[PDB]
Amino acid sequence: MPFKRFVEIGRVALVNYGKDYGRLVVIVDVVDQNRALVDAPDMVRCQINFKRLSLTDIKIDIKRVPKKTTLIKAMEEADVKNKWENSSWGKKLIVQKRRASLNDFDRFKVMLAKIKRGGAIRQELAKLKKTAAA
Amino acid sequence: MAPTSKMALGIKRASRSHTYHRRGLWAIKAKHGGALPKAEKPAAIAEPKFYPADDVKPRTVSTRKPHPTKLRSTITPGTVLILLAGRYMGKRVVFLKQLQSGLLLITGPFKINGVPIRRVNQAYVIATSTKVDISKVNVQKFDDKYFAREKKTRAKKTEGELFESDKEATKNLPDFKKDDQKVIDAELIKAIDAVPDLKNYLGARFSLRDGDKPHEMTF
Amino acid sequence: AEQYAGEYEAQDKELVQLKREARMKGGFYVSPEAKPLFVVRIRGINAMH
């Protein structure tokens, strides 16, 4: 399936390589089933060839005429959703970054501790099922 | 490039100062230099050869320089270290001081975790973001000369005597070091317990799981 | 070397802007070359006249 293709402004996309390596973008103008003109609010625009970049579920409502500034206004109106997106809602990459930066002494010590508390929960639950069984 | 620039575009600015200080005395080692020293009555053969003297002096200074800076990445006294090599490797330990040898004094408190006083190399170590406060610890007693491991000269005693085989060639525990270690360790424990759960953490060990990347892991 | 380019920066003004949207060029002024060369041998002595 050669990603989402269309004729319309406003569909958000998520990285599968570019430069940038973070970045979420919206398609401001549309130019065949490969190329797209992508921009993001405080970030430099590029019209770029993307056989292998795929577009996410969430769409933001924006119109024709795309400055740099117009995009920012739409982002302010939206906002909110972006926070959720990182964890779960299409993207998943941004939350994955956090895992890597979490093996750093204090962070690692805390991380191991979470699992230990979880260990106890599994035992407690298992007892309830076990009594019912036998 | 940046440290070496002063010397490079000077040539011998430091070494110029020393001659002029000597000359501040008046008139001196120009005259003394020709007269100065020994020679003429040889040994063995030609005596074509080598050292003591002159040569030793720059070499000792140069070997001192890697001990901070080059090896170090940056590390202040009381940084928590990971020993990646050495015997005690995988233990997280607290940094007491840097020796003249360039090896590091460390000590994990003996009771909680097995690490003794010990010398370890700087090169092995990963510098972690944690610091434990070594404000009022007497690290002073332990020095470079403190760490001489006795050789298998003879018996440990005064010398000149017929001896017995019950020496420790590659090892030696002085009794004095064991007494001293307890005192220094006591102060460290106070700092360690101040931040919670650090005490258990040191003994546990860090190692890289399958799928873990040492490059991404960097503390 | 830099002042040669700076001289033509000052004098010329017809070269740069419009000409991308057109072909040919007009007049004004010309920068000379005067260059020795360096020659490095890419290809061996095998199989050549």
Add this chain to the structure above:
Amino acid sequence: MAVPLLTKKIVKKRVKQFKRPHSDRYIGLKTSWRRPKGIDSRVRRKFKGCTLMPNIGYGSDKKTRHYLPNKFKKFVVHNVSELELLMMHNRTYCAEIAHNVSTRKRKEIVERAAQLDIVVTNKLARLRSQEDE
């Protein structure tokens, strides 16, 4: 000077060992190197794996030439008179007792050699000649 040159010679080795081609399957054809005269030999054409040929470049450092691995220069010593020449060198030269010399005459060579302090291999050769493993 002398010491790193010794290290280079002993550790590196061009103990390639120059075996004649088809020495393995013809017994009478000698182990000793002789140069393939014919064009048709692969060894002549310098194919690798066919046993590389002796050349000067394989050669060791000039100082380390004809030296025992101790860094002593080996000299086969026939009799007592020749020991006096070795005495001048001491460290540099070694004494090794000749094949021709019989057991009684070996003993006088050893005791004199001890005085020179060129004990190495001289004593060892003699000890076997007595009776010893």
Add this chain to the structure above:
Amino acid sequence: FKEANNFLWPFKLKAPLGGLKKKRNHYVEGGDAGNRENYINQLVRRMN
């Protein structure tokens, strides 16, 4: 200063880092060979 040429006699350049452009073509066709002022200095700074 054609006698401030009067060279050593060969500069023994290194083989280029990042390699050559193909040997079988001239400069125009994406080969290396022949005249080019800009890209000769680039090449010589690989041949350090």
Add this chain to the structure above:
Amino acid sequence: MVSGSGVCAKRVVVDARHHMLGRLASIVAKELLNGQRVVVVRCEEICMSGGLVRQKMKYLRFLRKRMNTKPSHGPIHFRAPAKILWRTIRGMIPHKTARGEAALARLKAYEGVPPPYDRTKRMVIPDALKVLRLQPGHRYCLLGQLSKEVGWNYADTIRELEEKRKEKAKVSYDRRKQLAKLRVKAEKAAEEKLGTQLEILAPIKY
């Protein structure tokens, strides 16, 4: 991106379900050389892209070349999907050396499912015919549609294949339901233990 499937410290079980025959064979062969112990399961259900006609004729001409001027002693064609797969790996791997013979011996082919491997076999990073295709991309032809036209081993296999799938399907679903249920009450039981602080940092580490 990063390959989640391939060489593993210990964890090599390979799904062949709707994989590409030669794509799978190539990567599996590399793993065998690397010293991994690869168990390919669902061997008959692997697909070869292209129209039936050109896939079939490839094997058909090989059968003719096996067929005549006869001793025995070598020229051979495999009738079975499992042994066609084995032959493919025996073309990838140097089949003229003891190391490659050993690597070949670390390959196992199981049809349907082995006696219960209750760990699922999981897909190799985009190996599959299904996805690599936009849907279509013309036809594909199964090994099990090729091998029925070549003779026995498939003919006995096909009846047996069905039976294994039905039995394991039932059990696998029922354990899934109970396993899922544990997680539902887990979040309630993380609150219940007074509360938690460290563990609510954990969904920020998804």
Add this chain to the structure above:
Amino acid sequence: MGAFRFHQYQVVGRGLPTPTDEHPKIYRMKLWATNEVRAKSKFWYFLRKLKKVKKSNGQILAINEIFEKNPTTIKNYGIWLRYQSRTGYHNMYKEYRDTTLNGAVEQMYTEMASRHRVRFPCIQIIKTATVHFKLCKRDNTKQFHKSDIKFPLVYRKVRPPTRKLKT
């Protein structure tokens, strides 16, 4: 584009001849090149083939680059294009939708490579002239953007998105 793609070069020159009151001027066909290396040879060749001057009597004043024309967005480069196949050079007029001059080269180069089988000894173009979205006349690529730029038809076939998957 990054690590070029083949920038079109606004190549400046003369036609250096004799201390006489006459002189030819420079003439240009605007050529895609890699930098200086590709540019110099074709610059001589255009003059030499058409009019003849020489190569030594061809003088290169400067080479000047290109900076963003079309502001990233789309405008319809009218190209007349010559491809060498089985004989000499054959006509083509492709007027297409494109980003900018880098990309414009790419789109023509791939069409030549595939269809007409083409490498460097084929020549470039004849002229490049942009035109407006409604005005541009031929077909395929241009139509999809044309219908969007004056809208009402932005809002047509918006249904493939989420339905690429299933919904």
Add this chain to the structure above:
Amino acid sequence: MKGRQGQRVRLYVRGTILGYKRSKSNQYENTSLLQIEGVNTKEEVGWYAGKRIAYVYKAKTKSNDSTIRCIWGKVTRPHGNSGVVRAKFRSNLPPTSMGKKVRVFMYPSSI
């Protein structure tokens, strides 16, 4: 014991010796190519330069009263896009080791 801590028997991140440095035609055993497990890219394998390598093996014979023997080495520089690395050893590793796991330590740490 001393040098002992609180768990991980596997002290190292894993690696594999695929082969030696090679053409299609020939090998040079002097340099060995190791593909290091979990190392996807050229950038990541750049970390591994300077690290110590051990090939630990067991043998029928005892030595200094131990059947376990080891050959040590060091990582020289990276090789290729896939996270392969170049390595030298004090004495060359046995080429039967093609397809074996070998151990790449953290031991001298640049970080």
Add this chain to the structure above:
RNA sequence: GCUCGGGGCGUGGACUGUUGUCGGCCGCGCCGGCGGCCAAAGCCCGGGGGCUCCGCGCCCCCGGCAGCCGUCGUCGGCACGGCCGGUACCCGCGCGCCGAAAGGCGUGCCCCUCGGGGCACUGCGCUGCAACGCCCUGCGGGCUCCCCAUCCGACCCGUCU
């Protein structure tokens, strides 16, 4: 006064293998600056035009502007490692003082005139530093065959050609 041995004290030397380091050579990844290419994408403000003539919108140009860009050139900074060697006559360097240490400590001159900088000013002597094992108990090792790995294997050589 010396020498052999013993007594008494201090320094620590025995093949070979290992690890730390200084210097040289080479690779390695990453970060930063300036200029070129009238500089301008760019954004806010302002003005006019075209196209669209269904209007949004699209385009184009010009003046003020955070801004950051692809390519060319150059300089600047880091972080690591391989290999070789330990520099055996001018490579490097010490010779008064303090400072575990590294390191710094004269003076004049001039630029900066702040922080600091550059620039001048004596002669001799001389080229390897830290550590571990053991030398004997015991053992590193060398060499041959074999097995496994790997490879040119144009059949082995000669001759004719």
Add this chain to the structure above:
RNA sequence: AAGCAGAACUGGCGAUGCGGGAUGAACCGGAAGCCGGGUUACGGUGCCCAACUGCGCGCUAACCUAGAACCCACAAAGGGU
């Protein structure tokens, strides 16, 4: 017509391995002391087989021979809604 017979120029083989062309005396790359370390050529990078199942943009669906690297292991007139 010929891997043919005979000239002209030049390079090779003969006097040439090594690397490449699966394999090949002559083609391609390059002339070769002995080694360590670096870096390339030719040619490659799915696996064999050292090395991107790398990115980009097209084309191809081949039941009467799918296609796949100069020399080179052949191939054409002519036909296809």
Add this chain to the structure above:
RNA sequence: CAACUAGCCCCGAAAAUGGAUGGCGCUGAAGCGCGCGACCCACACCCGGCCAUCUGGGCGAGUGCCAUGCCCCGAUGAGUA
């Protein structure tokens, strides 16, 4: 709607020991054309160590003697008849 242009695929294209893009196999290729990076890679190239040969030095004033010696150079080294 018609006539063309030229890509790949199809036809034209039929041989004998069974068979060869070298093999396996490969269909958003691992195919075919092409671009862009990264990367792989000869006894080649570089740097260092080292051998002989050649070249240029140098050091005998005797009383350690190879002075056809010793020591410093740098470049070079395939090799049949």
